[PDB]
Amino acid sequence: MKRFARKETIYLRGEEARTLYRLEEGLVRVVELLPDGRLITLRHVLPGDYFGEEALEGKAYRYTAEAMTEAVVQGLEPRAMDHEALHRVARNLARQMRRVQAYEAHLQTGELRARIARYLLFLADTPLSARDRQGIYVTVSHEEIADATASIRESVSKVLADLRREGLIATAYRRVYLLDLAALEREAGSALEAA
């Protein structure tokens, strides 16, 4: 077991894939740095999910895994898993395949405004969410939203300003408060697979 702080990486693209990991607590994003400098979120790893999947098939990781919150991960030796462990891995990888394909569709469904609303609602069901008197909120940056909505930070910031002005969200202390869930749901249209 090993703990990681927000923004620390669990593994990097191109490095030896000797270890398979299972996320115990927190939220991890698998990302790719594009030719033009853009960082793109490929998928979200949630508690219970196996990642560093390359350890099961290749020699090196193909992507980089970054903790989005304080995260607790368990390293595992692929070659030392029993029948029961393999069953859990197969079932969980199947669930992540369902989720990443849904995420893929989301990136191509609706204008930016709808994609942002959908992503915020998705995050509301992850370890990135919390609640207080002001309401439900998610701790995420404008850049991270851009990374998961096929857009750039400047465009995300503009839509967030619109949503603030309209009363759907509020921002404070690196958080995005979801003030009108019903309105956000309508903006997103279809929800994004949270489990």
Next chain:
Amino acid sequence: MKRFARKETIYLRGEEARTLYRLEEGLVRVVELLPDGRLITLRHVLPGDYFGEEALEGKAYRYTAEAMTEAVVQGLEPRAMDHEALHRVARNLARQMRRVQAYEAHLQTGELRARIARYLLFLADTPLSARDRQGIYVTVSHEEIADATASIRESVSKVLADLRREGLIATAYRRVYLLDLAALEREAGSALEAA
């Protein structure tokens, strides 16, 4: 074992996921029909790949699987797999996860022209490819290219017309001949994971 003809579906979104499948021959695409009528290719299933993955985790398929060529598939009972089978499934799902994330990145890397060149080169390494005197070719429609390049058919057709005029490709009998591989590689920039 069961054989499917091009365009026939192996399973449909929302139907009971009682069966896990392994593609023996041919090429299958997993797709989603979007709200606005758009069909989107979520991933490519190649010989050896397990699909209908929902049978390992849920009660119903979440997407639709369509044969892109004559395809031979083997149905499997998830609950009847031994240690060796589970190992193969885990390893293969890990490989498909690597490939679908690379596909995801491709959809957001470069202008349409580069995305089309990249997709054509990817297909050149699948069962959709063949060769004759005119050269290497891939049997694919303009619509299928649009479905896998985050674009619409009209836009794909225009770029293909440009590529024909420039000599990079030629078209005939529902095929796209790749005449200048070097030029296409340069257009694509980065290659798309073929295995």
